[PDB]
Every structure is written in structure tokens, then in C-alpha cells.
Amino acid sequence: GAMDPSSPNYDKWEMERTDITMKHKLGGGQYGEVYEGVWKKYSLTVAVKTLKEDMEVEEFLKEAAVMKEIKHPNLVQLLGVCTREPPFYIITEFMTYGNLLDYLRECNRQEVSAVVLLYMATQISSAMEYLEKKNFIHRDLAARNCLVGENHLVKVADFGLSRLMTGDTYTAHAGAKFPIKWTAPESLAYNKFSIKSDVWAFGVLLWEIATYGMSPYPGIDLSQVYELLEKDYRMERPEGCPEKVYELMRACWQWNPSDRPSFAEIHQAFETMFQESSISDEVEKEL
Ligand SMILES: Cc1ccc(NC(=O)c2ccc(CN3CCN(C)CC3)cc2)cc1Nc1nccc(-c2cccnc2)n1
Ligand SMILES: O=C(Nc1ccc(OC(F)(F)F)cc1)c1cnc(N2CC[C@@H](O)C2)c(-c2cncnc2)c1
Ligand SMILES: [Cl-]
Fold this sequence. Notes:
By secondary structure, this protein is an alpha+beta fold. The protein folds into two domains: 1-94, Phosphorylase Kinase, domain 1 (2-Layer Sandwich); 95-274, Orthogonal Bundle (Transferase(Phosphotransferase), domain 1). It is 35% helix and 14% strand. The protein is built from nine helices and nine strands. The strands form three sheets. It has a five-stranded antiparallel β-sheet with strand order 1-2-3-5-4, with helices on one face. It has a two-stranded antiparallel ribbon with strand order 6-7. Helix 3 packs antiparallel against helix 5 (195-210), helix 3 packs antiparallel against helix 8 (263-273) and helix 5 packs antiparallel against helix 7. The longest helix has 20 residues, at 114-133. Belongs to the protein kinase superfamily. Tyr protein kinase family. ABL subfamily. ATP binds at residues 26-34, 49, 93-99. This is Tyrosine-protein kinase ABL1. The active site is at residue 140.
């Protein structure tokens, strides 16, 4: 019996399907085959990713394998899998306040002050410093791919949104759907993805936080983004953004990937930046 520790077929991550009470599809279908679920014995709400009827079985099992290798307070936590027989499940913890992009756009601003936005950026930088140390690449870092929990807890996730999301967030490029405005120039021009191209996307994500979720490069056509960046254009400093924070965005957006800071340096910069000074005072001064 594969479920017993004695079994040489035992996998600690394999869970009993009957332990999960499957409820409705999450967020009106914005996540594809992801369902709200209840883990019986723990009376815990969970998020359950499944596969839609009938080659993507290998991508799904690869995601399950990657998730078993990663553990960080700011990375969505794997709780278990149902991969012995179809339908295949990936179970994670449910995050009360849902995705960060909608959260930023809908939040009460007296609550989600400059101090809270700084904490959210710092948490994301810690999750990314861990992925950098473990030699992983995210590939689609953005606010739409982060979740918000209790007490402004932020977790980085990866919802595989490219072929699910409606609108112009992701558009056709190199035979796939790219989020052009978050994509490092070497990723668009030379198909080069690395931790440094995640650094570039982090700079865009920082700008989303700094604007309460505004869409980047507003009013600029997607056909013009590469050319503008290649000619040294960069998004202007958001209104009220502290200069030290914008300096960090600009460092993320160096044309040469090798010139961008590592996530360890970005994380260290957030800790040091306001160790003595108040971000609240810097924002008030800027405004
Ligand atoms: C149910 C599930 C299944 C799998 C995943 N997976 C991930 O979030 C993830 C995170 C990091 C990696 C690391 N990886 C490194 C390699 N590169 C190329 C890709 C990323 C992989 C998968 C999340 C979830 N969780 C999830 N999914 C969709 C929506 C929600 C959700 C929505 C609202 C409230 N609470 C939770 N929660
Ligand atoms: O706090 C703010 N900015 C901030 C930036 C970085 C930062 O560091 C972190 F690391 F990124 F988190 C922390 C805070 C802030 C305050 N007031 C705003 N106001 C817009 C005009 C009035 O309404 C006040 C805006 C604004 C709103 N919409 C679009 N752009 C900017 C933003
Ligand atoms: Cl990887």
C-alpha cells in the first residue's frame, strides 16, 4: 500500500483525495483549473490545481516536482499532491486576500501605507533571494503572480497565466505569450532568461507596488517598448516614491543583465535603506 510508510512506493507528499472536500473554481476562472478546497482533518481552506480533460501532464508533474524542492515563508507552500492516478492535484495553502495586483488596486490606503508597501516589496525580495540561492528562475514575476495573506503577508506564486489571462497583459512573441512590459530586453530580443531577467521583472513589480497597481508604461504601445528601452528610456519615478526606492528600480533596469543587482543585494538594500530613516517621512517629503 503506497500510502503506508513501510511501502517502497511511499511519497510523503501524496495525499488521500478523500481528505479534500472540493468546492468551486477560484476567482471566477482567472486561474484556470484551480479550485477552492477544504482539508477535512485540519478544517483548512486550500487551493487545488487540477488538469483539464485530455501533453501538459509532464509540465504539471514537473511543477509538482519543483514545488517539493522549495520551502520559504514568502513562497506559496505546497501542502500535498494527488499524482498516483488521474485527475492530478497540486494542493497549496489558500491566501485570504488573493492576488497582490487586485489587492493593491482595491486596498484601503490608510491601512496599506508606505510602511506596508515596503514590507510587501521586502518579502518578495526575500522569496527571490531564496530562488536565486537555489538556482531557480521564476520567469513571470509580477504582482498578478503574488498572493496576500493575513497581516500583509505576501507570497510569490506562479499561476501559469500566459495562455489563461484575457486582455493585452500577455501578447504573441517568439511563438508564445509574453507579458511584454515585465520582460527583460534580452529575454525579448535573444530569448535569454536568467535570475537577472527576474531582477528586471522585480523592478517592474516594484513600480506596480509604488503606484498601487497601475499598469506599466501607460499610454505606450507594446510595439514601442523594446525600442524605447534600447534608447535608454525608463519609467519615471512614481509620484511620492522615495528616491532610494526609484534608484533600486533603475538598478533592476540596467540594459546589461550583469549590471543588475542580485536579489541578495536587493534584499540587503531594503533592510538598510530605512534602518534609521522612515519611509513614511520620505514619501511625505516627495509628495
Ligand atoms: C493550487 C496551486 C498549485 C500550484 C501552484 N504553484 C506555484 O505557485 C509555483 C510557485 C513557484 C514555483 C517555482 N518555479 C521555479 C521554476 N520556474 C520556471 C517557474 C516557477 C512553481 C510553482 C500554486 C497554487 N496555488 C494557487 N494557485 C492559483 C490560485 C491560488 C489562490 C488564489 C486566491 C487565494 N489563495 C490562493 N493559489
Ligand atoms: O506610499 C506611496 N508610495 C511608495 C512608493 C515606494 C515605496 O517603497 C516600496 F518599496 F516600493 F514599497 C513605498 C511607498 C504613495 C503615496 N501616495 C501616493 N499618492 C498619489 C498622489 C496622492 O494620491 C498620494 C502614491 C501613488 C498613488 N498612485 C499612483 N502613484 C503613486 C504612492
Ligand atoms: Cl528554473
